[PDB]
Amino acid sequence: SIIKKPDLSDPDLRAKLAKGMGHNYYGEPAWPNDILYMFPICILGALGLIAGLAILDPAMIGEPADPFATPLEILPEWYLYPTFQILRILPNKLLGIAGMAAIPLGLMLVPFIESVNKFQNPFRRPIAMTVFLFGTAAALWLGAGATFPIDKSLTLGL
Amino acid sequence: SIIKKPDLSDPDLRAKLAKGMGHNYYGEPAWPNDILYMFPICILGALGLIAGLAILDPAMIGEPADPFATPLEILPEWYLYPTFQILRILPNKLLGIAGMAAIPLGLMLVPFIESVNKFQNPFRRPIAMTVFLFGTAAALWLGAGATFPIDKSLTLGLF
Amino acid sequence: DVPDLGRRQFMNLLTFGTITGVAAGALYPAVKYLIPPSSGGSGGGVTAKDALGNDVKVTEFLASHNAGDRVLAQGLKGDPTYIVVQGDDTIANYGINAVCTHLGCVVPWNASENKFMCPCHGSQYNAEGKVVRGPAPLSLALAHATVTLVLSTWTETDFRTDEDPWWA
Amino acid sequence: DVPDLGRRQFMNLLTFGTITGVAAGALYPAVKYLIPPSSGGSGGGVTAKDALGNDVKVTEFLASHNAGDRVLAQGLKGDPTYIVVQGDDTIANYGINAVCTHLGCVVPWNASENKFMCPCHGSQYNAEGKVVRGPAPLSLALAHATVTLVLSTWTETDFRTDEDPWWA
Amino acid sequence: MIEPLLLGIVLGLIPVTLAGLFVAAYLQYKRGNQF
Amino acid sequence: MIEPLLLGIVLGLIPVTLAGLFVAAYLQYKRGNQF
Amino acid sequence: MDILTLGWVSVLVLFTWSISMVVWGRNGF
Amino acid sequence: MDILTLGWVSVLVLFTWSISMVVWGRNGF
Amino acid sequence: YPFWAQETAPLTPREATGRIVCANCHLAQKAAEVEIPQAVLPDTVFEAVVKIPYDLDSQQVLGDGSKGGLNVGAVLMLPEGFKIAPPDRLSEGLKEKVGGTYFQPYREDMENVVIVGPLPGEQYQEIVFPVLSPDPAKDKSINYGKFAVHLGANRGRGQIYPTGLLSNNNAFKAPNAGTISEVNALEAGGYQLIGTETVDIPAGPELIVSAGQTVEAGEFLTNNPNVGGFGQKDTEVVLQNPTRIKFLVLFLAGIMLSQILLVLKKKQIEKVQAAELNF
Amino acid sequence: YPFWAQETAPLTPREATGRIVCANCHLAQKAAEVEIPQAVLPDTVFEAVVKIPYDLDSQQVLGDGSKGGLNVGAVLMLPEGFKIAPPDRLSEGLKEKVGGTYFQPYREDMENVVIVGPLPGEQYQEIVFPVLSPDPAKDKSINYGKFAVHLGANRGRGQIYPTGLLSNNNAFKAPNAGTISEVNALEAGGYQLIGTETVDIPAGPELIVSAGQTVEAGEFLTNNPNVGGFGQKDTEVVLQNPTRIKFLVLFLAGIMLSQILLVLKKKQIEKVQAAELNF
Amino acid sequence: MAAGVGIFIGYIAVFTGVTLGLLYGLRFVKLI
Amino acid sequence: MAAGVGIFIGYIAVFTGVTLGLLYGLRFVKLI
Amino acid sequence: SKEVTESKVFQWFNDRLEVQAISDDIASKYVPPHVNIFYCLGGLTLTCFLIQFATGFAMTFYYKPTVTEAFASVQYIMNEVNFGWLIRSIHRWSASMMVLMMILHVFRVYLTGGFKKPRELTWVVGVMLAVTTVTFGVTGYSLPWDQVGYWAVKIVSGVPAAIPVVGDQLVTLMRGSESVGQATLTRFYSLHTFVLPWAIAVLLLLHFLMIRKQGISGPL
Amino acid sequence: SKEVTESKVFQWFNDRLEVQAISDDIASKYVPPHVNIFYCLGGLTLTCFLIQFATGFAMTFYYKPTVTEAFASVQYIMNEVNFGWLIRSIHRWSASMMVLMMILHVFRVYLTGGFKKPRELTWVVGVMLAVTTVTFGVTGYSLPWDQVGYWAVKIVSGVPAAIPVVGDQLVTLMRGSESVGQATLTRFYSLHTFVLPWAIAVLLLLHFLMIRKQGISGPL
Amino acid sequence: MTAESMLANGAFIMIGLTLLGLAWGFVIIKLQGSEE
Amino acid sequence: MTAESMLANGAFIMIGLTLLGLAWGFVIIKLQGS
Ligand code: HEC
Ligand code: HEC
Ligand code: HEM
Ligand code: FES
């Protein structure tokens, strides 16, 4: 209906809550309130935005590939801007590969490095949030510099 | 514990058996007896047979496509031999399309046409067995005829 | 009051009919995309192509064939059509569509028997395309081969079976 | 009187080790298939191909290019190589691999300032491949021109950096 | 094109599989079930 | 190449999402839960 | 007035309205 | 000592042996 | 004859449609079989048995007009690399089996397509071709695998000469409809039919239409004395690699050892489960 | 000047690498920017502002040797189908805004690529190109979509003439290493230097290397008097079909109405559930 | 960028108005 | 087609023999 | 481990995902005595399909689906690629064996009453699986763009030209153009490698889920 | 029609497959009060992939993965095919928005503690999903075979050459040859249309199964 | 909106529209009342 | 085999080998009994 309070008198639900699971057993019912009526809202919104971006900003065709003439400015997709920047500024290409590959392998260790505390709120995780903010800022800075000449790529034009 | 008898003293198992299900609740255990030790035997048998057929009878490249030259013999894969036959002896092309499309549509009506009796043993459903044997014979006869000149495709040679 | 079955069904109809309208408006581009583009050349304005995809040149076509020789070349909708050399000129009024009317095989021409003989099942046509033997239900389609080479869709009455063009 | 943990594990080891041997014997063909076949010829069996894939004859370079020009052609390992015209002759004994040694871009020639200037990061190579500036760690590779043409592999010691060929 | 080996495999495996299926059906026909 | 509209969308949606997540965290951090 | 402006505004209002409808339908944020 | 015969026999006996092992392991047909 | 196929179609006897050029002149179609081994090993000599069957008690008309026996002939298109084995390599048993049969490569460097004939049909209804298989180990342009083997075999005389003229071994027709009524032996077995419409029947065939009858247009004036015919057939031969078969045998033996071990493991688990029930 | 680019590269002012041929003789590098609308309508005259920023006070060495102002020039490669609008299509405001600047198509049938210059850079910091978008509805060779607009703009005197002879607006270099140890003004501002070393220097640049000393191989003997430079700016423009935007607006309005109805249905179902719990 | 603001305001006003109208006119006829 | 029969017979005999040998050996060493 | 016998690191997964639930679900099913060797046929079909999923996969790394390179790519696989002959021949033979095993599976199901109530939906989804497999074979027969495959597709694609009204539109839809050319090869490659793998995966999921829910059929 | 209301020709399906069981399982789940709008991000990522699964699907009917026909096929899609501009532009934009929604989903998961115990495996599978999507876009950026895509692949494919031992071997394995060309285009097209769609489907199945088993994380 | 480059303007508009969408959702929640 | 035209021979071999597989499975079952 409006909301279902957690039945703490239930032994199985309390055991699940102690284990971190069992949170999908209280609140508003998922069907049809959210899955049938709220999910289509987001799906239609996403489809409409993507179609609008496609119509108002179509994909350009380009020029046919020439193996003998590299373009003046070559860049991967935007989400590869940081890693590509690493490749640009690390003179040791092996170190560049290690740094580029340490992102997906470094994220797989996040749930295990931060298994020290049960806290989930950012305001109860000072070190974790400091690391996250520093990393997000560094990734954004590298991505922004990827659209710069290799000279002023570390200062963003100061 | 080799074979587990069906516990008919269970109301849920009895209800499932009345409904036709519940036959996966007795006999030899599925795991690991069958799924872990008998399934890989069949998997490896199929792998070895198919690899041996590939090695001893390798696939042929063929002749490059010529849109201007029709081969003397054109044939689909073997399982399309009957339908192809239906296409080439039926003079009305619409009737050939109907005959080719009535196989998948006629096969889906089998569980509903034969919904008159709950007999699973073939010897307790003689009409179904006669129809199935006639269908197998007709399919094999059409497939055999598909590898014949259109004149001889009916009688296959006639002795 | 509580919305009963009728009111809830009406409200469902409204919401999911707007959903269906949006979905159909989105699917119309999807369906029209999977439909092949209307770029099948021109039903009456496509020249003659050889097996190499080039335009066959009439000057090259002339003085390169014997009397009454039919060699086929790509034509209407990519279907191979015979360009008949009747003996004096290098062209004729009509082009016989080699694609058979039984299944779709390309019928070869036996000048030895002066007939179009299908190899798949033995369908036979006369010199002009009119059916005389075999299980081919209808006659081979014709065309207009004009130059001074362009072959156009045939519309006039069929001078072989004495009827309107079945292919049209 | 029944198989304990040790005997059951030994039987599992035997059975599934034989199965793993069969699986390895079946996956070796798959892995060898997914590895691209070595069909690039050899280090000394790669001729100089043009943009269209045809070889450029040494005789053609006369009256087709100016004096002292450097022109790109397909070279060793498929990468573009600058074949050099010496002004009086048509080729030299070496061809300069145009692929940059920093990231991989094809370095254009610059006759005015007599240097190879990478357009992506500005690294500089002299008229013979030696590094002059920029973030490029190594020097441009050298393709040993043979027919005076085939761009074989240059394995003689560098006449630029005085060392063994890093490309070999 | 006709593949004689493949057609032989098909025409050797279809009749024997049908015969085995009918034989198993007969064997279950002349006796009782599990319960 | 660089797509300026897409980069604008990204650089607008990243900081606002981060700020909203932190604000929701603060609101849930100054208040209790259901149980 | 303009038509390019009309399309850009339509997409922007669709984004805003999708957020607004998700917030209103779920009764809060 | 025919290699082609050896391969054909090997494939045939693999078919037969797979059938026989499925019959033996499952303890009946 | 085969050399007329060499002269009419000098590049290949098989057109792009798969039809041998021998059917342009030999109109009748009968059976022609080729027994080629399913698989052959590289650099091995094997016999291709071309059966060209027809009853030996049926005699065809000859060019002069008299009847007589038939002469067989064949063209065997082998895959690239195959060729008729030289007399040095083929065995003495195969030497007495092939006899003094003569094989031509139909072209220079095209030794895979070998023609033979005309040979008398009284003893050459079955022709042995001593084919030599190539070895992809020495020749690098030849590969192992399955390839097509085409055959076209003929028994009787051809209807049409390379000059387009008709032989006497076929049924003759009328140019159109008329009233001939003029049958006379032209000092031989041939007739001269002249309402007045010129046509000449050679000595071979025998008139079937009665004189003084209004014949239709394009109708058979005589019968068809074509006893022979031309028939073609395509099969497949596998140039097999012995190493492939050796590793296949090893692989299948390993598979069956694995199956045996799997059944033994199931037996052990069955005993374990029986123990767990009889605790 | 851009006509020297028409002579050096008579086909296209851009190479396959993307570099404009202007940089071949304009060795320096500067900033050049173009304000192209993101989307334009077909058959609509729109302004493209090409800005060539440089300090107006800064003066370069002229062709004779004296200091002087800088003239600006540009090449704008509009997409295939675009063209500078004829004076009749321009409105009064746009016609007054563009001024009397003269544009050229750079070639026959290449009216999309438009060159301009040299123009006095004191007032022509920004050059307004009155581009005319094509009409894909009429022109069947033009399609709606996103296309690349390349721009190459220069503001200083070039360093290399079309014949390869260097100008005076660059720093000169000794060919090799030597002790030239001689300076002599050639009866003008341009002095000359004379192992065996032969270096000539026009009136443009200023010396930094003293006389009577060792000169290494290829060092900057003179100051670099260039104050301008050449810059490129690759941007994008969308030739938009208004029907697409109309149907997009209709589709998005339908989406928003559907979302409103979904929320209303959720409210109704919540109302129903609130009463079903009140049992 | 300027008349676009006016179109945005009008578009939001129209859709908020129809949202509230549908809500109140469907609760009025007890449909929701 | 004739020596193949001999190869098949010998091959079945060999693998049946090794099957029975493995079974009885593992029964003898209490592995089964 | 048979299913689960003696494990200690397994607790890390079991406390999170409750893997023992899956263990006890799998180990709770039993195989009734009336299950013959003929009940292995349907699974064999799956086996063959997996081979088609594997060897087809490999052949997607070298096959060029264009009319100027399809034949060249096929013979490049056969002759130049390492073990390419083996992969392609296995794909062909396992396609044929998939169809054969599926036919024998239909024979078993019909002759054991495995389609009757409550297994009607299982049989319907099986027939749809059969149509999908036939579509696999049809669309893969023309991929080599040899003469037999090209003419087989040119014959089967012109069959809908007999339907009075929508015949031409259907022929164009299956061919992607007026005649069998590059559009036909592109559409058939998309069907063979993308459309039909996903369609048959969905149908197999439905088929196996229904079999798991309803179990095997009863004795005869 | 809400969840199940008055479905009575539905007794057939419920009697055979017992689909009221899955109906009640779906209806037995609840959404906690702490679930805010940011929990819609991951689903939006899935939404984007669905669009990529559809529109990319469509582009498999007209795109030809050959260096002599890839760019021409892409421009044929843009210029000739009905709504081909729309399909291709939607594909590119929804790829970009897939990655953006993925990044926002990671931000939500990290800033809400959703990766903590017992959801470490969900985070690992999510990181594998992120790698799959990044390499998905990497393989697809050069399918048009224009200057940008070709040179981006020529840049990123020769990177592994810095590894001393298996460097050039890895470079050759990714490129399908020693240099970027037709083999690279064929391998990248196979990865884009066949390999990685299946990989991401399996990873999405694992992700969603773990989430459904463990539910949403606790309140902050 | 018919501008030339939408990087900075796009980001600012995206932030503003996200905030405005949340605000308008809450405004509609306030304006929907409780019960008539 | 080493003999082509494996249609009839192939069919007979498949039938005989299926029967022999069943028979040999039963033979091994009978010979395995303690
Ligand atoms: C060889 C000895 C056999 C036997 C006796 C059986 N099969 Fe299979 N099987 C496979 C799959 C995917 C399924 C469906 C799984 C599911 O229901 O979710 C089955 C199902 C069965 C059953 C019914 C099981 C049930 O719970 O109802 C039976 C009795 C059965 N099979 C018998 C897959 C495979 C294989 C995959 C490679 C192989 C090999 C086999 N099966 C072989 C056999
Ligand atoms: C038309 C140009 C022909 C081609 C092509 C082939 N054959 Fe023929 N053949 C043809 C004629 C007109 C004749 C008889 C000529 C005469 O003066 O009698 C023949 C004859 C033969 C024979 C002899 C038959 C006999 O003596 O009874 C043989 C064995 C034969 N031809 C074989 C043969 C083969 C194998 C061909 C394909 C390579 C072939 N011929 C082609 C006309 C033509
Ligand atoms: C295609 C890619 C992805 C899709 C479709 C996806 C989808 C989802 C969905 C629908 C949820 C349910 C809760 C929600 O919607 O917020 C979820 C939760 C989760 N996701 Fe993903 N996700 C993807 C990638 C990722 C990535 C990249 C990560 C981490 C780097 C990740 C880690 C998680 C975790 C840990 C949860 C559980 C959080 C919780 O329960 O509170 N996923 N994902
Ligand atoms: S096309 Fe079939 S008989 Fe001619």
| DSSP string of D2-52, one letter each residue | ---HHHHHHHHHHHHHHHHHHHHHHHHHHHHHHSPP--S--SS--B-B-TT
DSSP for residue B33: I
Q: Nearest CA to J54 among J128, J122, J115?
A: J122
M206 lines ligand 1 (CB under 6 A): no
- Give break positions in chain B: residue before each, C–N beyond 2.5 Å: none
Coil/strand/helix, residue C124: strand
G3 CB near a chain J CB, below 8 Å?
Answer: yes
Among the partner residues C7, C14, C26, nearest to J261 by beta-carbon distance: C14
I166 lines ligand 2 (CB under 6 A): no
CATH 1.20.810.10 fits domain M9-214: yes
Q: What CA–CA distance (Å, rounded) separates G26 from G21? A: 8
Strand partners, J75: J115, J152
Q: What CA–CA distance (Å, rounded) separates M19 from M13? A: 7
Contact J115, J74 (CB under 8 A): yes
| Residue J50 distance to chain K (closest CA, Å) | 21
CB contact under 8 A, I35 and P4: yes
Q: What CA–CA distance (Å, rounded) separates H13 from L10? A: 11
C53 CB near a chain N CB, below 8 Å?
Answer: no
Contacts of D129 (CB under 8 A, 6+ apart): D96, D97, D116, D139, D140, D141, D142, D160
Touch of M by B (3+ CB pairs closer than 8 Å): yes
CA distances from B13 to B8, B18, M32, M215 (A): 7, 9, 14, 12
Strand partners, J154: J73, J230
Q: Is the peptide bond before J118 cis (omega within 30 degrees of 0)?
A: yes
Task: Order the strands of the J126-132 sheet from edge to edge.
Answer: J33-35, J45-51, J126-132, J83-84
Give the chain J residue nearest A53 (alpha carbons): J248
Element (H, E) at C24: helix C5-34
CB contact under 8 A, H27 and P18: no
Contact M77, M88 (CB under 8 A): yes
DSSP for residue N38: G
Q: What CA–CA distance (Å, rounded) separates A120 from N34? A: 12
Q: What is the largest CA-CA distance in chain D?
A: 95
Element (H, E) at N104: helix N84-111
Backbone angles phi, psi at C116, to 5 degrees: -90, 115
Q: What CA–CA distance (Å, rounded) separates C59 from C89? A: 11
- Buried b / exposed e over D18-38, threshold 16 CB at 10 Å, is bbeebeeebeebbeebbebbe
Bridge-based pairing state of the strands B28-29 and A28-29: unpaired
Pocket test for ligand 1, best of M22, M25, M30, M46 (most atoms within 8 A of CB): M46
Which residue has tokens 């100054």?
A: F30
Instruction: Please report how many Cα atoms fall inside a 13 Å half-sphere around the Cα of residue M194, on the Cβ side.
Output: 22
Among the partner residues M5, M6, M83, nearest to D32 by beta-carbon distance: M83
Task: Order the strands of the I230-239 sheet from edge to edge.
Answer: I39-40, I230-239, I145-154, I71-77, I113-120
Six-digit token string for C59: 């000057």
Contact M11, M4 (CB under 8 A): no
Find the I94 Cα to ligand 2 centroid distance in Å: 28
Contact D134, D142 (CB under 8 A): no
**C-alpha N13: how far from its chain's center?**
33
DSSP for residue N144: T
Among the partner residues G2, G4, G20, nearest to O25 by beta-carbon distance: G20
Residue J196: what residue type? T
Which chains form contacts with chain L, at 3 or more CB pairs under 8 Å?
D, H, I, P
Ligand 1 atom at shortest distance from the alpha carbon of M36 = 5
Contact N180, N145 (CB under 8 A): no
Coil/strand/helix, residue D59: helix
E strand map for chain C: 46-47, 69-74, 80-85, 95-97, 109-110, 115-117, 124-125, 131-133, 143-146, 150-153
Bridge-based pairing state of the strands J235-239 and J145-154: antiparallel
Strand partners, I174: none
With contacts defined as CB-CB under 8 Å, which chain I residues touch B38? 262, 266
> From the CB of residue A2, how many other CB atoms can be counted at a distance below 10 Å?
10
Backbone angles phi, psi at D86, to 5 degrees: -90, 10
Touch of E by F (3+ CB pairs closer than 8 Å): no
CB contact under 8 A, L8 and H6: no
Q: Which residues of A touch G (CB under 8 A)?
A: 34, 37-38, 41-42, 44-46, 48-49, 52-53, 55-56
User: Binding site annotation covers C65?
Assistant: no
I74 lines ligand 2 (CB under 6 A): yes
DSSP for residue J107: S
Which residue has tokens 């279902």?
A: A4
Coil/strand/helix, residue D151: strand
Ligand having the closest approach to the CA of I259: 1
Task: Order the strands of the D142-145 sheet from edge to edge.
Answer: D70-74, D80-84, D95-97, D142-145, D151-153
H6 CB near a chain B CB, below 8 Å?
Answer: no
With contacts defined as CB-CB under 8 Å, which chain D residues touch A97? none
Q: What CA–CA distance (Å, rounded) separates M173 from M191? A: 13
| Rg, C-alpha atoms of chain E | 15
Residue N150: what residue type? Y
Give the chain P residue nearest E12 (alpha carbons): P11
Q: What CA–CA distance (Å, rounded) separates D138 from D131? A: 7
Helices N84-111 and N70-79, axial angle in degrees (round to 10): 100
For residue D158, with 0-12 CB atoms within 10 Å meaning exposed, 13-18 middle and 19 or more buried, which class applies? middle
Strand partners, L7: none
| Residue B58 distance to chain E (closest CA, Å) | 11
Contact I262, B35 (CB under 8 A): no
- DSSP assignment of M27-78: TT-EE-TT--GGGGHHHHHHHHHHHHHHHHHHHTTT---STTTHHHHHHHHH
* Per-domain boundaries in chain H: 1-29
Bridge-based pairing state of the strands I39-40 and I230-239: parallel
| Residue J270 distance to chain G (closest CA, Å) | 10
Q: What CA–CA distance (Å, rounded) separates M38 from I74? A: 49
Which residue has tokens 């003659």?
A: C48
D20 CB near a chain I CB, below 8 Å?
Answer: no
Strand partners, I108: none
Q: Nearest CA to D75 among D106, D101, D103?
A: D106
Touch of N by K (3+ CB pairs closer than 8 Å): no
CB contact under 8 A, J256 and K15: yes
CA distances from A35 to A40, C22, C87, J257 (A): 8, 19, 78, 19
CA distances from C59 to C70, C89, C148 (A): 16, 11, 11
Q: What CA–CA distance (Å, rounded) separates I134 from I150? A: 17
Contact I191, I208 (CB under 8 A): no
> From the CB of residue B116, how many other CB atoms can be counted at a distance below 10 Å?
10
Ligand 4 atom at shortest distance from the alpha carbon of C99 = 1
> From the CB of residue H8, how many other CB atoms can be counted at a distance below 10 Å?
26
| Residue D17 distance to chain N (closest CA, Å) | 28
Q: What CA–CA distance (Å, rounded) separates B132 from M111? A: 9
For residue A105, with 0-12 CB atoms within 10 Å meaning exposed, 13-18 middle and 19 or more buried, which class applies? exposed
K8 CB near a chain G CB, below 8 Å?
Answer: yes
Interface with chain N: mutation pick from M66, M76, M185, highest number of N CBs within 10 Å: M66
O23 CB near a chain F CB, below 8 Å?
Answer: no
Find the M43 Cα to ligand 1 centroid distance in Å: 5
Handedness of CA N125, N129, N132, N134 (dihedral sign): negative
Protein residue closest via CA to atom 1 of ligand 1: M40
Q: Nearest CA to N192 among N73, N60, N84, N62?
A: N60
CB contact under 8 A, K30 and C3: yes
Secondary structure of chain I in the HEC alphabet? Answer: CHHHHHHHCCCCCECCCCCEHHHHCCCCCCCCEEECCCEECCCCEEEEEEECCCCCCCCEECCCCCEECCEEEEEEECCCCCEECCCCCCCHHHHHHHCCCCCECCCCCCCCEEEEEEEECCCCCEEEEEEECCCCCCCCCCCCEEEEEEEEEECCCCCECCCCCECCCCCCECCCCECCCCCCECCCCCEEECCCCCEEECCCCCECCCCCCCECCCCECECCCCCCCEEEEEEEEEECCHHHHHHHHHHHHHHHHHHHHHHHHHHHHHHHHHHHHCC
Among the partner residues J145, J255, J269, nearest to A60 by beta-carbon distance: J145
Contact I189, I201 (CB under 8 A): no
N207 lines ligand 3 (CB under 6 A): yes
CATH 3.40.50.2300 fits domain N10-214: no
I150 lines ligand 2 (CB under 6 A): no
Q: Which residues of N touch D (CB under 8 A)?
A: 151, 154-155, 158, 172-173, 175-179, 181, 183
Find the A13 Cα to ligand 3 centroid distance in Å: 24
Residue O18: what residue type? T
Which chains form contacts with chain J, at 3 or more CB pairs under 8 Å?
A, C, D, G, K, N, O
Contact M66, N182 (CB under 8 A): no
Contact M31, B28 (CB under 8 A): yes
> Angle at CA B26, nearest 5°, toward B21 and B27?
130
Q: What CA–CA distance (Å, rounded) separates A115 from M17? A: 17
Residue M78: what residue type? M
With contacts defined as CB-CB under 8 Å, which chain P residues touch I274? none
Q: What CA–CA distance (Å, rounded) separates D74 from D80? A: 5
Backbone angles phi, psi at L4, to 5 degrees: -60, -35
CA distances from O26 to C153, J98, L4, O30 (A): 67, 50, 85, 6
Element (H, E) at A132: helix A126-145
